[PDB]
Symmetry: D2
Subunit: 256 residues, 4 copies
Amino acid sequence: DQLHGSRVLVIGGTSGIGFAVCAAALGHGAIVTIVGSNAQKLKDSVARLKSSFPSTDPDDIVAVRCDLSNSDTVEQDIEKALQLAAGNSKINHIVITAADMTAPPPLEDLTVDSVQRPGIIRLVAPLMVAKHLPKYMNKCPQSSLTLTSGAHCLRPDPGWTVISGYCGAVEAMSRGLAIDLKPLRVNVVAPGAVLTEAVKDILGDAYDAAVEMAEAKSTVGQTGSPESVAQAYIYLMKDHYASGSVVSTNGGMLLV
Amino acid sequence: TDQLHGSRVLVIGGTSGIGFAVCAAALGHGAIVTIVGSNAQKLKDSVARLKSSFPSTDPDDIVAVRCDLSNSDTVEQDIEKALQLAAGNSKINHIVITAADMTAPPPLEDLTVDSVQRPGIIRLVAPLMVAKHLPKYMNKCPQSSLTLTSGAHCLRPDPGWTVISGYCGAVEAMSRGLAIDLKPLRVNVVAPGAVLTEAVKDILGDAYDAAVEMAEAKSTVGQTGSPESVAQAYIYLMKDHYASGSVVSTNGGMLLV
Amino acid sequence: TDQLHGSRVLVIGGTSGIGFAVCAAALGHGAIVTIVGSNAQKLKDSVARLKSSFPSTDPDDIVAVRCDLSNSDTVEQDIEKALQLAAGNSKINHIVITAADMTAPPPLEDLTVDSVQRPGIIRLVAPLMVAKHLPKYMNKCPQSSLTLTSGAHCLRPDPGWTVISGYCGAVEAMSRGLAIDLKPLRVNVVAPGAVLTEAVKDILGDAYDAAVEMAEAKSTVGQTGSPESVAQAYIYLMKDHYASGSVVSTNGGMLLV
Amino acid sequence: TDQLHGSRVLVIGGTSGIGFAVCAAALGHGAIVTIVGSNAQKLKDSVARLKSSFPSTDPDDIVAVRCDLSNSDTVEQDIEKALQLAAGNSKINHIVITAADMTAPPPLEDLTVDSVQRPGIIRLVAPLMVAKHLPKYMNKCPQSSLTLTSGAHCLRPDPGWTVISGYCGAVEAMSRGLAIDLKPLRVNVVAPGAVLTEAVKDILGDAYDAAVEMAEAKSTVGQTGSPESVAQAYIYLMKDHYASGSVVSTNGGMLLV
Ligand SMILES: NC(=O)c1ccc[n+]([C@@H]2O[C@H](COP(=O)([O-])OP(=O)(O)OC[C@H]3O[C@@H](n4cnc5c(N)ncnc54)[C@H](OP(=O)(O)O)[C@@H]3O)[C@@H](O)[C@H]2O)c1
Ligand SMILES: NC(=O)c1ccc[n+]([C@@H]2O[C@H](COP(=O)([O-])OP(=O)(O)OC[C@H]3O[C@@H](n4cnc5c(N)ncnc54)[C@H](OP(=O)(O)O)[C@@H]3O)[C@@H](O)[C@H]2O)c1
Ligand SMILES: NC(=O)c1ccc[n+]([C@@H]2O[C@H](COP(=O)([O-])OP(=O)(O)OC[C@H]3O[C@@H](n4cnc5c(N)ncnc54)[C@H](OP(=O)(O)O)[C@@H]3O)[C@@H](O)[C@H]2O)c1
Ligand SMILES: NC(=O)c1ccc[n+]([C@@H]2O[C@H](COP(=O)([O-])OP(=O)(O)OC[C@H]3O[C@@H](n4cnc5c(N)ncnc54)[C@H](OP(=O)(O)O)[C@@H]3O)[C@@H](O)[C@H]2O)c1
Ligand SMILES: CC1(C)c2[nH]c3ccccc3c2C[C@@]23CN4CCC[C@]4(C[C@@H]12)C(=O)N3
Ligand SMILES: CC1(C)c2[nH]c3ccccc3c2C[C@@]23CN4CCC[C@]4(C[C@@H]12)C(=O)N3
Ligand SMILES: CC1(C)c2[nH]c3ccccc3c2C[C@@]23CN4CCC[C@]4(C[C@@H]12)C(=O)N3
Ligand SMILES: CC1(C)c2[nH]c3ccccc3c2C[C@@]23CN4CCC[C@]4(C[C@@H]12)C(=O)N3
């Protein structure tokens, strides 16, 4: 594997998809830097990651708490996470899955700041990553930055139009960063229905009616496993020719 | 013959360029047009020629309102005023939004948190505020339409205008979400290519002639797009009562070479 | 005032359904329409039904030609003749192709090499034969247009019409290739959704009523597409001299739910 | 550690180019590879190349069969032998199709009904014949995959390859239909960009060095695609048990410039 000695920055690797990416990354022996905002399960996630890979050097699994939902500190924090992840070396791949995980208000009660508050973590944080990565990454086709969107960008869930919009912005912005940061490669993974611990939290009591309706809306009779969706991120790290692309893993939900 | 005769159109951003050609086309079909802009004068100037290129129309079918949508205070109450004015005694039949800041972004080496967020109030919050308040001034019927604006830069972004390609990418995704939020009302996007509007003359300054010639060369047609040809996409989307959630791309085959 | 008045329109497949509505819309703008079909009876009925909806139109603006484009040994020759009389004295301005066999394919249990290959003559070979010979009969100029036909089934295919989803997917890609082969002439595609033409009731037989509800429900609008609304997409692509390499999708938001 | 270890992979078109790189990658994970080609020599030679780069693998994990899929008789029966072979006593886990004629089409001045039709036997009929017979040789299970092949030319067609761009458009649409026909089995497409296989040098001849220089410049990366990088997309779809109905594009950003 050519991801053995690799340094990968997983912005949002404390839970769900991003965590599965650090598990997959550690399976190939890479050095993984994790970024989250909750200090306690960031201890739990990183402690959880070296008992599933106990032969891996513990110093190759580093964590930092960063709050990227706040307009100050995010440039200072993104720059700090790139310093920690780069170390003496340069970072080889960056993965961003961080999202605010909050239900928007209905459209009749839409507020100006309601529209803008997601943009800080969906748009401003990656752009600050794109702002500062040349100093911490070599702009060569062997390095990658991968952003996150979803199938909801084409089949929006009801109530979620605004965040459904921002994922549309992530995909267009991804392509622009492939020109801004060329020949460095940047791409997007667009997952479908992944039953992460966060999703269980969002829908609460309406969860099981939603799981069965998600399973029914797939060519597979399934929702997506977190470690299978993680293969899309690993793919874009190993494919030194993929750039400006959208990797869609949705179980055929857009076909039914 | 024409079903846009008695129909009411609100063109948010119709004072120049593409939006103005949409108001000209709408009045060519006899529609009642309300125009929204920010420059106080040049808003009379386009209102002046449209009763002078078609004096046929009753002068009260061409009404105008000044709105500043670049500032987060003022945006909900300004669109609300323009919707009361376009609807009048009836309800609005079609809404067209072309309003955009049209100012050069910084390079991303000097990217600031404010550079990223300020385009969104006119590109994202203004249309969402339209979607918030249009039900009381439009009937939610498939004979009604709301059309947003995109570009080919959403798929082939201009160096480096990455941040605003994102917002146009957000416009397309948001369009689809609003097509289900406002069902059975129709929501769509127009994605123009290279149109030589009076703003583009201003933004390109001295690099204009080198850019016009490379735009004509990046086309299957050997030309740039007329504003009056692109306006047909907005007029088309008002007449097609089955088109919703779609992107009408008119770019001279630019994405093909 | 209208720029489709003197123009020559050839609708390959204008004897029924969507293509027929395109000739109705074209005649509303005063165009000279040549109709092409394979059924001598559906071709006399179509020209008769168009001289009772437009009695003021000159009878020479509605001429028809009989062509069987499902057969390989004469599809090139038939296309050639259709072109020559549609141009007449002058040149052809726009060509619209909707022709399709509209017969259910066999299930995958009985798929045959010929089942897969026969549709290609009318879906792929006839349009390519049109592009091969139109230069003597059209000005390859941006005010000229060639429009092919696709559907939403190319992205949401219907069971078991997988093979015809393939051919409609092939039409969209070649559309883009012919915009470069035929540049600066304009080539585009319309992708309709659910249009209840007379061919569609024939395929659905007794399951028709259950299928209409199914479609109606599965759309953002509460409707199927009118033939006269989908026809707006073809007329639009004739009026927008900048639209090229594009896909005009008319689906009632079916791809959103 | 590896879940492609006991896995049986059928690479239809693995004697050269991309499909060959897919068989190399599969054997790196310990998969059992069945290779299909039409050149007996290439096929033995290709199998010889693979057991000298992997001398430790059991030679029975590298089995080959000669198939001519260019002809209407024997193509269903050759697909059927190849399925028995790959399956053996177990069932097939993944199928990869890269087989293509790789010959320059004639110009449109000499376009014939047969030049158009003939590619469809290997572009469309062979995969459909694979989907027709694989259920007795594959589970219809989410852990098994069928991967077809398209390319970036389906969206930015190279001249004069319009007809072959069309067939690649059919493969992607057919992929989506086959993802529903064979559900819950997974069906997908890989859309490579510029890969300098020996077949591409054969087509480009003396214009090769000028063509690679213009291909490298038309990418965001300053390179063409490695066969070993593009093969990772096929391996990925074996690895992602949630990917279905998708297009994995690996083109070096050529569609951005
Ligand atoms: N799951 C799906 O079906 C689906 C579909 C489409 C798109 N997506 C996108 O996939 C990505 C991953 O989603 P997920 O299912 O894995 O949910 P998740 O487990 O909640 O992932 C969120 C990650 O981001 C962190 N985070 C939350 N707020 C943060 C903040 N202000 N600043 C920095 N980090 C923050 C979280 O750490 P903390 O513990 O500190 O909060 C966590 O590590 C998201 O972008 C999502 O929008 C998911
Ligand atoms: N022309 C092209 O080649 C091209 C290409 C791709 C995309 N587009 C997009 O198409 C749309 C039309 O562009 P255009 O070429 O026609 O330029 P334009 O003539 O300047 O159109 C701008 C319209 O919106 C108004 N406007 C600007 N800022 C406003 C603000 N804060 N509040 C309210 N109204 C405001 C303008 O009037 P004021 O004078 O009062 O500001 C004008 O009526 C834009 O969204 C553009 O991004 C254009
Ligand atoms: N209806 C829908 O909902 C829908 C949706 C998506 C896509 N489409 C596609 O749009 C196109 C039009 O479909 P439609 O609904 O209008 O069905 P249609 O009424 O049967 O249209 C078929 C047209 O093509 C002609 N035609 C058929 N075979 C011919 C042949 N060998 N030679 C010459 N002409 C031939 C027909 O005339 P003859 O009487 O001589 O056969 C007729 O004018 C089709 O390609 C269809 O697949 C339709
Ligand atoms: N390289 C690119 O730039 C590029 C770009 C887009 C798409 N693609 C697509 O990628 C696929 C792979 O191409 P490639 O470049 O790897 O070319 P390649 O090496 O020529 O691949 C051809 C493969 O197909 C087999 N094949 C050809 N004709 C056959 C027949 N009649 N029966 C059975 N097998 C047959 C060949 O075997 P024999 O020669 O043994 O018969 C060989 O295994 C092709 O579909 C190509 O169009 C390639
Ligand atoms: C819609 C959602 C509540 C949901 N409902 C499910 C049912 C079954 C399996 C997964 C889900 C999910 C995951 C989602 C996907 N959406 C993409 C942008 C906003 C949202 C909301 C959230 C998100 O971030 N996670
Ligand atoms: C890039 C731009 C300066 C430009 N350069 C040209 C050269 C030749 C012909 C047209 C143009 C245009 C029109 C554009 C298209 N872009 C889409 C989003 C931002 C921007 C900027 C502006 C816009 O709104 N109008
Ligand atoms: C599938 C079909 C029988 C169908 N079943 C419906 C139920 C409700 C409303 C509309 C339909 C339609 C319209 C379709 C769409 N398909 C696109 C290519 C082939 C086909 C077949 C036909 C076509 O041309 N018209
Ligand atoms: C067009 C082609 C001759 C070509 N010309 C190049 C110049 C520089 C770098 C790469 C190429 C290629 C690779 C291509 C891509 N096309 C996709 C379908 C048919 C074809 C033909 C062939 C293919 O399979 N490989």
